[model samples]
Target: MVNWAAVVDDFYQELFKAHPEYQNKFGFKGVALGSLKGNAAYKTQAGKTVDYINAAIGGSADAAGLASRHKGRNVGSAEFHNAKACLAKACSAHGAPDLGHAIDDILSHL
Candidate 1:
């Protein structure tokens, strides 16, 4: 599996760009993220996100219920799609265009 930790910033950079209003919800907005496991945000959404992506790569995050879980985030459905779009954009930048497509496919389930 790719070390998504290295590109987490790029993911969030695009995410927050579209949803600037939700920055405060993600506590790591101002913190530096080094090691994926070491980042404070890892405990928040980073690790869950990592697991969700990895699961998508592996075939199914159904057991993880990623989308429905995020539904509880207080954001609208369009916002959820925005998050997926940003993720796809970041995955495309990482030479994983196919992976991004696969991720979006999974996100489409919800």
Candidate 2:
């Protein structure tokens, strides 16, 4: 069977590698990893989904133009959608902002 925990760790590693600038954006990297494993799994999953949406939007934009317009097109699309989805689910589960808002806020930065 595939090791999901390892997969999550690897995912974060790759994310950091691609966007080292985001390191301080969330504070300690180890803390972020632990949060993702424990209380933040849903956020991680939602984030992955949002990433897909952004990638799709970006790909479409690239097909149409090669300027700021293309880049701006996907700015809030992923963030808002992922935030709403994750927050709604968290509220339903009676979970607090510990994980939900963290991911939501991160998305907003995009």
Candidate 3:
């Protein structure tokens, strides 16, 4: 898979630019990209499975305060649903069938 974590900041910025209405709801503003690390995975090296890293991103935010920024906008719920749809599509596009199912489960939680 491509290194999505490396470009997450730019991606979110562009996403906001494309959908400015989503900015306050998703709390994209002022959230700097903090970290990009990978999970533990195995890769074949010399006929042996060796541990390898995958890509993930980390950022900081105050969960309790995030929703208030979009007060009266009702944007948070819509953003959550849209995000779930987008993630589902992404996982499917990557041929990650199980991940796509997991995305569906997350959408249910939202």
lDDT of each: 0.63, 0.42, 0.36
**Pairs of colliding residues, candidate 3:** 38-54
**Residue 79: error of model 2 in Å?**
8.3
Give the poorly placed runs of model 1, Cα more than 4 Å off.
Answer: 29-39, 42-44, 99-110
> Which structure is stronger by lDDT: 1 or 2?
1
lDDT of 2 by residue, 9-103 (tens): 44455454545554444435445444554545445654654454344434431322222332464434443453455434433443322234334
- Candidate 3 C-alpha error for residue 22, in Å: 2.6
TM-score of each: 0.66, 0.28, 0.34
Q: Candidate 3's residue-wise lDDT over 66-92, tens digit each? A: 345434455455665555455444445
lDDT-based ranking: 1, 2, 3
Please report how far candidate 2 places residue 18 from its true position, in Å: 1.1
How far residue 97's Cα lies from its native spot in candidate 2, in Å, is 28
RMSD of 1: 3.8
Which residue pairs in candidate 1 have backbone atoms (N, alpha carbon, C) closer than 3 angstroms, thus clashing? none
TM-score, prediction 1: 0.66
lDDT (Cα) of model 3? 0.36
Give the higher-TM-score candidate: 1 or 3: 1
Sorted by TM-score, highest first, which candidate order results? 1, 3, 2
